[PDB]
Amino acid sequence: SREPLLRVAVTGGTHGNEMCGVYLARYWLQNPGELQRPSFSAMPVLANPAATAACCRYLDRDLNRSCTLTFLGSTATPDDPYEVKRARELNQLLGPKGTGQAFDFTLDLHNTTANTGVCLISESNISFNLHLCHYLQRQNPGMPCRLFLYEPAGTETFSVESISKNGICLAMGPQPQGVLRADLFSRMRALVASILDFIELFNQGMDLPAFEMDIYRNLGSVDFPRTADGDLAGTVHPQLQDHDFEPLRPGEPIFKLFSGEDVLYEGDSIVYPVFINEAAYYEKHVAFLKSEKIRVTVPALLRLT
């Protein structure tokens, strides 16, 4: 039968300049009462302390790309990237990744400079995660809450939340890095509260009926237009800017070059752009991710068969 989630973490500041999670984590470390439910208490964690102190995404390496078994399992060294060192600590705290000692669930908080609104990023189609999203949607009529299915292309998962048995990322934008907006802070805070409510209901044995829902599944990235030297030759087109999750159709403009020309989408199908013009993605060569919108059937989670 159903195993309750008793070891639950909420991580903020995985990227040190994403301010909602930074300040929620700091606040809850001073005031943990908010994270307590009848069946469990969630542990708040500031994921990247040094980056947070410096208010930057990362010091040496992206922490949210440093949690592969290869990194975690490798022999230490004084000259290791700071974030590799910190990944190993999180592995001790919340893992070890891939063993029975790992936490039951980690909720990881993110901001984006893209106009995403509320987005749950899941690295698998695990039905619990889809039920969680569905619950948030129903708790918030008229507020988009979208599930972005981002399955790792490589061999190894790499994210902070992947350390635990299961987990999910709550991402909210748009918000400039290093800026804390009251509106996003409060909303993220209430959504976390609701996610903890959900886990509590689950722990109490609530039946979650099977249902269908639309999700967005990652197809790949499109890079900024570049010169031969890889310097920007333009940026996201005004008609694409801020239109995350909206249909992008072949023939439609996606970039405006500095020379004044328009670049058109040359794909065969309508896709759904996500994370359009994210500051942190310039160096990753990503102007946006392409996703396909798909209707999936989510099995029931019942206490008994």
Next chain:
Amino acid sequence: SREPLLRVAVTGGTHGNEMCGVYLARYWLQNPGELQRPSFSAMPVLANPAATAACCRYLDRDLNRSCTLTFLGSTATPDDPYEVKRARELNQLLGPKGTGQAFDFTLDLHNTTANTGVCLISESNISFNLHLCHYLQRQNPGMPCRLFLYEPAGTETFSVESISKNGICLAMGPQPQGVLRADLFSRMRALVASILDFIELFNQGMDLPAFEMDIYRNLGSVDFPRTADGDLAGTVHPQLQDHDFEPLRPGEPIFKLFSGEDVLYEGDSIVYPVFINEAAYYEKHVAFLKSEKIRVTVPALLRLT
């Protein structure tokens, strides 16, 4: 009679993560033709090369606070802040500050994460600068173009543009640091073109009739609410957020504390908040600047008496 402005510079990337100026400066260095007018050609300059390369505001010290006579005149040292070293180079290029060798005019380009729209920041009430703003307003009906008079409180001016005999800052927001928006890029680009048009007209001997206009004069800053340790205890209130240049009246809410309480403005007069929730200003302890809106009379600039 009238002295024409023949040595004119446009500086971008004074802060390395403010993307319009960074990319305009880089573009114009490759394609200077755009900066040429019949009577003069403006020199594009990337003000902070190392910060720009790292995409950060500054390395050691804010370049736009490093151009005091004290810094510029002090004896060099290997252990000098990078930006102090670079300030001295700009002093060689565009100055020396306070001598007859200085450039006639420097236009310095900025972005802000605050919802300022188009703002010209002037460090004095020099009539040329007010005529320039008035010209931009008339060239752009229905587009706010506001003059922010920011006279240095201290003894010494400190900004990159203060190196020249005269100058002004063109600031545009909102834009996240490290993000280039097509819309702001194009608009800043056209406004620069118009500013160069203005200088050309001036050089040709055009009479500029006296006129009146509203400007915004700096009164001082209000800091974020803090704990005894100086950590944020809250942020800009949702009703104040994004309302730059709008009236702020005593009794109105300016902050939302994490504890949930509202903080009200306690001033005696209606003021006009500017640079509300700028990322770079957190460390400067500035949540917003207070300004007074004043109608001033601008004398004529005529070719002859």
